[PDB]
Amino acid sequence: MSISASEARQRLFPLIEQVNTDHQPVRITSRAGDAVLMSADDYDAWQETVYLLRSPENARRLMEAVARDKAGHSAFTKSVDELREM
Amino acid sequence: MSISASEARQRLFPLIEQVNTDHQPVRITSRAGDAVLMSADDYDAWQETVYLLRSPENARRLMEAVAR
Amino acid sequence: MSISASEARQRLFPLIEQVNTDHQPVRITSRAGDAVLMSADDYDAWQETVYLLRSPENARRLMEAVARDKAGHSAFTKSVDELR
Amino acid sequence: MSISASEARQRLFPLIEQVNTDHQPVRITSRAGDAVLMSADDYDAWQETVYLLRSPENARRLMEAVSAFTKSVDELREMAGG
After folding, report:
1. What family is this protein classified in (chain C)?
2. Domain A39-86: assigned CATH number
3. Does the structural domain C39-68 have CATH classification 6.10.250.330?
4. How far apart are CA B15 and CA B10, in angstroms?
5. Cβ pair C32:B40 closer than 8 A
6. Angle at C41 between CA C16 and CA B53, to 5 degrees
7. Which residue of A85, C11, D7, D29 lies most exposed, with the fewest beta carbons within 10 A?
8. Strand runs labelled E in C1-84
9. Which residues does chain A have within 8 Å of residue D17's beta carbon, measured at their own beta carbons?
């Protein structure tokens, strides 16, 4: 979860499998500054949902969609549970 | 809507049905500060979404799930 | 810690000053439904600051702009002065 | 503007430098799946500001961060810290 740009340039393939599995960002350090590698799905999803949050009513529309079905229930309970653990 | 504090005071109960129905906030003017009246479900969903947005993976999980 | 709509309609004015002085939203419970009353400023800032994070890269520019706000007009003029 | 991991591997050092100079993220595509590389300072601002936004008070404070009067603040400051 933190490594030199030097160790990361060798190890990009497994770092990318990594961020896409455990969904944990990787800090890459460097003399010319530090960087974060992350799952590109996660990042994109994060942007696109903030895109939809133009107002409280959209946040409400999101929660409902989540309340609609059993897969919504699953995904939302796991998120709250993640939260509850930290 | 967009009204005065006295206008908002006498009209307060229909304002609460209005907010719970059209989900639009109501801007109340007063020389003591402006205020917004919004539905409680809207407020709670907004604040909850923002809290859940702490983890980016959560967004991806909100997304994947609606699409189920 | 909520208040009934009837108590709210009564005390609207002091509720309004108070939502703006202490900036804490008040929850209103009624037979007509539930509401939250908060300052227009908290509400505008909530919506706009989220809109700005549409690009995660705005976060740092928000942080720095607010830092330049707290610095004062003072920091600017000195910048201007350091010269060619 | 996405590059292959095989490209990212080659110019990893200038890429890290770019991301931090430009304050723009880079999308890396690879046989191992997709990633986004971003300045660490800016990832951090981003996680922190979303954390702060839970609260509408903190949000207000991000919007609203902001003489003879101002003179005397400076005077008191100095008096209080000298």
Report:
1. Belongs to the phD/YefM antitoxin family.
2. 1.10.1220.170
3. yes
4. 10
5. no
6. 120
7. A85
8. 3-4, 26-30, 33-39
9. 30, 32-33
